[PDB]
Symmetry: D2
Subunit: 275 residues, 4 copies
């Protein structure tokens, strides 16, 4: 059945379309550590023929202390994205945290992201909506998949129909997340079949890793419009998000598995196991 299609330039992101990759790093540490990470992603996805979008946050708005590293900030962050654009010609996705950040950021990036914790705030959605940019909504850990149907409506109300839904796990007791593989279709269903992607790096959150490939495989096998991931040359030295970051050098072998599973799965004929 007609899966909606959200296009990000030459890439068209859909559910029955081979998976698009929204990968990068957590925060824009240094213009140096970017170029590097971005460069590897481009090479690999280019070589494997995987649609690609580079992600990196420009401000950590919800850490633990008012003093913790938050990133280079909006202004400086835009500078880096611009170059990544000039230097590699990639599309970019980054999250915005306040209504007044939406356009300035849309002016620079291709996809603006609505953080999980602010997914229900009307003013941010609207500002984010009027921008006309492609939207990636992080599904709140505390909202059931059957409820994403409201958020997509909110955006349409604001004139934006380019919404992508991203699962990043659900609360499982205290300080724990579990990924409900059955949630993907529910989200699809209640959202007019909007594209559904899976953020494997945040779904692995405790309070990690040898399990990144396992969880990602599981999700991709369900049949998704895309995968969201973060990597790092050194996973336990980074400032912001800790483990759960995929080791940069492992990017290629990891993506071969994903593409392989996606191609196989997207290639299956329809199978109705209900009757």
């Amino acid at each position: 059945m007609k899966q909606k299609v959200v296009s990000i330039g030459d890439i068209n992101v859909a559910n029955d379309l081979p998976f698009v990759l929204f990968g990068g790093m957590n925060v824009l540490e240094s213009r140096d550590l970017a170029m590097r990470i971005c460069e590897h992603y481009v090479t690999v996805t280019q070589k494997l023929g995987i649609p690609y979008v580079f992600k990196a946050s420009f401000d950590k708005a919800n850490r633990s202390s008012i003093h913790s590293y938050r990133g280079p900030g909006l202004e400086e962050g835009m500078k880096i994205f611009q170059e990544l654009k000039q230097t590699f010609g990639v599309k970019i996705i980054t999250d915005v945290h306040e209504p007044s950040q939406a356009q300035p950021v849309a002016d620079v990036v291709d996809v603006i992201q609505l953080p999980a914790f602010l997914a229900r705030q009307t003013d941010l959605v609207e500002a984010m909506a009027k921008t006309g940019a492609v939207i990636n909504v992080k599904k709140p850990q505390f909202v059931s998949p059957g409820q994403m149907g409201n958020i997509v409506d909110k955006f349409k109300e604001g004139g934006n129909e380019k919404v992508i839904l991203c699962d990043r796990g659900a609360n499982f007791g205290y300080d724990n997340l579990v990924v409900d593989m059955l949630g993907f279709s529910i989200m699809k269903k209640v959202s007019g079949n909007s594209p559904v992607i899976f953020d494997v790096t945040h779904a692995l959150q405790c309070r990690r890793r040898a399990q990144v490939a396992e969880l990602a495989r599981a999700g991709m096998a369900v049949g998704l419009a895309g995968l969201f991931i973060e990597a790092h040359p050194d996973p336990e030295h980074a400032k912001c998000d800790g483990p759960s970051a995929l080791p940069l050098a492992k990017l290629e072998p990891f993506l071969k598995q994903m593409k392989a599973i996606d191609d196989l799965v997207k290639g299956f004929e329809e199978l109705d196991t209900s009757k």
Copy 2:
């Protein structure tokens, strides 16, 4: 052991102090429906000798549609609070949703509230922190009680030590909340014994009521610094929050139970059941 003390004028809010009431309505529908509700609360708490703070939100920032009733807005809302003040001489608590709302609102009310979903946003906390007002933090449904210790620190960093912690339930599967009666002490413990209150009306949330007295009794029996509640002359006609609102006429009999339980419990001698 020394329970910290947060004072709101002539009321001093603490854990080993008879419970303070943060009660009112969900949203400032009409200056009319306020005066009324506020008037009943004052009369009853006055008569029963219950410390009291009137609560009402001035904007619904997280509803379901960009068009749903959100309240009278900041400006108009302040107008109503002012009168409630002039007409009854009460203290007021209301939630703020953006960093730029913190002072203007602190200028008018006695307690500013940090919504559950934005409890981890640094800029709001700081703005909210610099105001110097008394703070009521709604504990996120998705954060364990043992983590409230960070938020209190965030506020201190910003120069504010007048923080009250409020439990409003924890995610239990999808679209459901459960109240962990053991969380109250954990919150106490990790927060330098900050005052802990219980928002019984939001803890009853599905996707309600005959159970408001039951849940409230349970919480008060644990021994808390306060209770947070919302009422309405007509619980199923209100625009914003639905049921879970206590019927106004039932306020008095309800509070007699609470005070009775609180006085009895606060009156018990120390009981260490660990050794």
Copy 3:
């Protein structure tokens, strides 16, 4: 509304009746350590005027290793109960794990208990049902309170209407339990108002204690037909159940709180907070 009434000799156990105590120890370690524990319970409950039933298990059917201490066994266990009876004249409650144990045990004790994990096994219920003894059903950590309605029916089918329902917490993520204070009334409601008691010692289970009084207070404040508890002269030396055991010496001060809360709560007039 008419709360059903289940009588255990001179004690009549009901929801609108002052709470009955089903307290004791986990396992029948030694005839020595029994007499002792049993003796203290009798003295205290006798002095406080609390209806009482002594509990102790005669076999640990679900430990971790085939070699772990399981208790004195059925035969030897009955011997000890008999004496406890002769020596103190108390009523007794113990759990049974197989259908062929039901009568032999009913012949000796006053209340037979259906373990949480076997609450849904038909043969055990029936054997347990035909015995005609008073039944205490431990609510499975994995079944919703709204489902206890089936189990009471199962017993009636087998000719037994003397069923008491006991809450012992619900699964909260992995290796954790949370007590839903709202479950008590649901259980009441779906079971023709059968008596509902709360097993505070098992509800405190991790993978404990300073919180026994807190949780117990919370539960008793809801208004229950009874409390289930285990104690020990030395809580961290016992073979079987670890902490969560109440220190024997603290029994009296603990029970004063419970009775006080129960008397106060059972004494309140009806309060309907739904309209």
Copy 4:
């Protein structure tokens, strides 16, 4: 790393070995409806080259009423299995519910299954252990994967090292299950790498179906030793387990997907995403 190997005749069931199928029906309704179902499974698995074991329960020990259909009973059930054996030459797996059923049943079947609710009962494990038969342990919905390590030990203690671990979901709030795709490896890890299979039909349990293929794909993509499933010519007419039963006619197309995913996944080179 060496995955243990549990052999069931000419089939050797392991984690790095192509998946074995433990499929059939819920209960042995009629010798008629068996032959049929069994016949289709054999044909399909034979044609696809999928190792196969036929499953059917001979007694519903945990239904809702003492009168609900429970199956043909032990004796009569064995009769049917015998024929299924004579007529098709298949291996068989069935669950046992009491210690005295273990051998009589082992004498007839190839794999005996330990129900989820009785996974922690020592006497059943031992009886089940001494039998020397291959064991399939249903992981309790209420036990964390990290705990299966104890159960495998229990069996070894009883002299049985032919244990297969089967996931069938975990409690997610009330009346709901969620499948933690990360649990598979944890179970592997704490059990000396025992074979891990996934019971997709019971993992879909509410209080179902179009999602059977989706969930199964997800699990198989993680890389498992096997799949457990139940089917029926008519999924909503059956007496015992309702939906979640796969429509018999859909067996073949369903299994092609599974084999395809398994072969692809089992074929990948090692991928360590932790460093």
